[PDB]
Amino acid sequence: SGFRKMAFPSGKVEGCMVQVTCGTTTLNGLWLDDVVYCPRHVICPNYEDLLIRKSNHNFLVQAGNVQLRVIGHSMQNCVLKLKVDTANPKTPKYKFVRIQPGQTFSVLACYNGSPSGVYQCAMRPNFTIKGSFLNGSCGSVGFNIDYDCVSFCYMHHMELPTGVHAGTDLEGNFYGPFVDRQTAQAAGTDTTITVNVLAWLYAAVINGDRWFLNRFTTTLNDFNLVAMKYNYEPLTQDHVDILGPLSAQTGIAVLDMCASLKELLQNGMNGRTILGSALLEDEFTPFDVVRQCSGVTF
């Protein structure tokens, strides 16, 4: 029993974190095989013009107490790839994957190439992440683990004026309409991840919290008309299908759980909590709920 915001074990990623220094800027790099990946703003913009002026020895890469030798450099979108003379002996089995808004991942926050903490978060529908990052955190990475393979999905680049964070996949493509430069950029209006709130309501039922259940059902169209009014993302048939296993386990149809959610939006919690929360939680996917209520190991 119990339900916590759980991150993947970070060990396989900790063994890849390095410190990258260029001039006065120090940030984090990800060392996989003989390449160190880091945000291209470490050279700071006309990034090709700034990069052409740099030589290999201008990039100082430190792995623990060992200085790595940079033997080449190239840029891929907003990510700088530093070829080093030593392959990381701790390189895990890995993939670079681009995630969708609503999907969750673990973040290993780092400063000076040293991991300081791990937390779980979700890619918001406005493509920002509500992270916890201070100056020096750039280059910290987001990941998921499937079996023994680490899927790297995020690299931290910047903090927006509202305190939320923006970054790229490991191929340097930003999530959201953001650019790596000091300009007037703002996070768009955010919405609630509906399929994740539904998954969290199923987790609450599995853990013995059923006060919000009712005898009613709804159509997908009527639910979406209600959901649009409360700044909730539309629920698609794909979301209904994905919630199938949780529906079969608890005996509560997806549209029956939607009728519970509709009543919670229209009337509130009335002084009650669900899984120790007074707000509807949207940072657990249906897969996260099934995994945490089954004990899958890595």
Helix axes 254-267, 220-229, angle to 10 degrees: 30
DSSP assignment of 12-76 equals HHHTTEEEEEETTEEEEEEEETTEEEEEGGGG---HHHHHHT--GGGEEEEETTEEEPEEEEEEE
* Shortest spacing between CB 85 and its own copies, in angstroms: 25
Which of its own copies, Cl ion, ligand RKR, none does residue 182 bind (CB under 5 to 8 Å by kind)? ligand RKR
41 part of the active site: yes
Residues found near its own copies in the complex (CB under 8 A): 1-12, 14-15, 108-112, 114-119, 121, 130-134, 136-137, 159, 163-165, 207-208, 273, 276-279, 292-298
Whole-number Å distance between alpha carbons of 185 and 16: 31
- For 217, the 3-state DSSP assignment is coil
* Shortest spacing between CB 32 and its own copies, in angstroms: 16
Nearer to Cl ion, 151 or 260 (CB): 151
Helix axes 254-267, 194-206, angle to 10 degrees: 100
Q: Which ranges constitute the DSSP H helices of 236-285?
A: 237-242, 244-250, 254-267
Residue 162 within binding range of ligand RKR, rule CB under 6 A? no
Whole-number Å distance between alpha carbons of 111 and 126: 26
Identify the residue among 3, 36, 123, 180 touching ligand RKR (CB under 6 A): 180
Residue 40 within binding range of ligand RKR, rule CB under 6 A? no
* Catalytic, out of 38, 41, 121, 165: 41
157 part of the active site: no
- The total number of residues written for the chain in this structure: 298
CA 271 to chain centre: 31
* Catalytic, out of 138, 153, 156, 165: 138
Nearer to its own copies, 208 or 251 (CB): 208
* Shortest spacing between CB 47 and ligand RKR, in angstroms: 11
Q: Which stretch binds Cl ion (CB under 5 A): 54-62, 94-102, 112-120, 248-256?
A: 94-102
Whole-number Å distance between alpha carbons of 151 and 147: 10
Task: Note the residues at the interface with Cl ion (CB under 5 A).
Answer: 99-100, 103
Task: Note the residues at the interface with ligand RKR (CB under 6 A).
Answer: 1, 41, 133-135, 137-138, 157-159, 165, 180-182
Q: Which residues are catalytic?
A: 41, 138
